[PDB]
From a paper:
Strikingly, an open structure of the wild-type channel solubilized in detergent micelles or embedded in lipid nanodiscs is achieved in the absence of applied force. Therefore, we asked whether AtMSL10 embedded in a lipid environment, without applied tension, renders a closed conformation. The most pronounced differences come from the outer TM helices, which undergo slight rotation and outward movement from the central pore, in comparison with the structure of AtMSL10 in detergents. Interestingly, the CLD between TM4 and TM5 was completely disordered in the lipid environment, further indicating structural flexibility of this peripheral domain. Remarkably, no discernible densities corresponding to lipids bound to the channel were observed, though the channel was fully embedded in lipids. Therefore, the structures of AtMSL10 in detergent and lipid environments both represent an open, conductive state, further indicating that the wild-type AtMSL10 channel, unlike other MS channels, uniquely favors an open conformation.
Amongst the Arabidopsis MSL channels, MSL10 is enigmatic in that it has two separable functional modalities, regulated cell death signaling conferred by its N-terminal soluble ‘death’ domain and force-activated ion channel activity imparted by its C-terminal portion. When heterologously expressed in Xenopus oocytes, MSL10 is indeed activated by membrane stretch and displays a preference for anions. In Arabidopsis, MSL10 is primarily expressed in the shoot apex, root tips, and vascular tissues, playing a critical role in adaptation to hypo-osmotic shock and induction of programmed cell death. Analogous to DmMSL10/FLYC1, each subunit of the heptameric AtMSL10 channel is composed of a transmembrane domain (TMD) with six membrane-spanning helices (TM1-TM6) and a characteristic C-terminal cytoplasmic domain (CTD) shared by all MscS homologs.
Residue numbers in the entry:
A (entry chain A): 248 to 312, 507 to 731
B (entry chain B): 507 to 731
């Protein structure tokens, strides 16, 4: 449609120019009318050209990538309108020399104020379209808080906290910060923490490892076979600090399933450490009476 | 390679714009007021777009000139260990140890220090333990000898060079110790690192248990009424 409109406009402009080229206005007044008509044809051809290139830009951006697209389309259409009207006026050239310079200096003063905000606006566009870190419906982390996404506007993005609290971020601020995406991530790993006494024999630790491996093998639905049990520093030679590393069959996008499976794993570890006769105790204290 | 292709596309776009504009200048069809109007439009354009080109260009310099890491290696930023898979002009993508995927800006990373594990040599690890102030010197010497012997018996995982250091005494009751040793690997091999550290900790525990070394709290005296 745009190509056909541009072709028709160009054909009309060429026909008008050729008719006005072979025959030129005789009366001085007719010359001004002919010049105005030629300027109008040129301005219409131009405006169609800007519209066509703007449409091509919008379509390529959409292909690379909806509310944000519509807002961007409206903004660029406004820019197209202002530029085409101003260059039409320049073709008219009705302003005096002092008036044209006055408009130019008004543009200079305008630029500072509005471009100052256009800095944030343009960097937000680049963040949304070029970086494209997340999409509507996925779960993301910013500053360690887990949130969801529903909206995408040019200046702001809207999120829901785990308690469904609705938040409205600026897009420029997010451009400066790191962001994690759960929907785009692969299957994950979770760690459950526990501590045991320094007196625990090595054989008990080996039995605990064997039981943990067996249990994780019996549940392929929730956990990957690969796992690891690691030891952490010893406190006062009384406490051993332990951690179990395991991988879900899901991401953290499935929050409720994540928490329920973690709870089940914790209960299993508790049953283990209770039925293996593993106990933790405080350091003994000696007392002198008087 | 992705960064190279993106840069090629960007520079081709710049080439296209410059060649077309200088072709138009050769044509010289615009009026004097029109040429000046286009020049001032360029002036106004420059501020807005060059403001972002600042970040873009510093990111290019960071990626290509500095070149601190490559795809597949493990790096540290702000103390968190992560992996790398992607390299884009504006952003880099990493995986946390829990496989969480993150999308950094490249300009922000340019301002920050970065550590690379794949480019580093064989490393050192430290295991912490404390013992009582009453421990005799001979017991400490025996512990050092046993630690040296054990590290010698395992050349596969540990370098012969090591050191046992003492740290400040707390209330003249607690001695704080630390053992320094070097792996035969880097921290890029995370699972092997953790497993070997766990084995070393278990060995140290067996030592301190079979050498009859005990730690105790300070005694307390009480007056009854």
């Amino acid at each position: 449609k745009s190509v056909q409109v541009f072709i028709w406009l160009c054909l009309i402009l060429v026909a008008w120019i050729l008719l006005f080229n072979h025959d030129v206005k005789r009366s001085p007044a007719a010359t001004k009318v002919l010049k105005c008509i030629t300027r109008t044809l040129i301005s219409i051809l131009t405006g169609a050209f800007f519209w066509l290139v703007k449409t091509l830009l919008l379509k390529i951006l959409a292909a690379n990538f909806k509310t944000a697209v519509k807002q961007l389309n409206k903004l660029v259409t406004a820019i197209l309108m202002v530029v085409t009207v101003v260059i039409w006026l320049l073709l008219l050239e009705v302003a005096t020399t002092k008036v044209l310079l006055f408009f130019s200096t008004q543009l200079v003063a305008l630029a500072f104020i509005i471009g100052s905000t256009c800095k944030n606006l343009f960097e937000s566009i680049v963040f949304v379209f070029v970086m494209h870190p997340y999409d509507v419906g996925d779960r993301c982390v910013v500053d360690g808080v887990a949130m969801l996404v529903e909206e995408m506007n040019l200046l702001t993005t809207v999120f829901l906290k785990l308690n469904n609290e609705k938040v409205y971020y600026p897009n420029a601020v997010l451009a400066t910060k790191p962001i994690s995406n759960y929907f785009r991530s692969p299957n994950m790993g979770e760690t459950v923490e526990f501590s045991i006494s320094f007196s625990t024999p090595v054989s008990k630790i080996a039995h605990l490892k064997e039981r943990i491996a067996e249990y994780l093998e019996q549940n392929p639905q929730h956990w990957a076979p690969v796992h690891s049990v690691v030891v952490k520093e010893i406190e006062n030679m009384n406490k051993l600090k332990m951690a179990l590393y395991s991988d879900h069959t899901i991401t953290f996008q499935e929050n409720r399933e994540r928490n329920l499976r973690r709870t089940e794993l914790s209960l299993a570890i508790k049953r283990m450490l209770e039925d293996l006769h593993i106990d933790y105790t405080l350091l003994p204290q000696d007392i002198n009476l008087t």
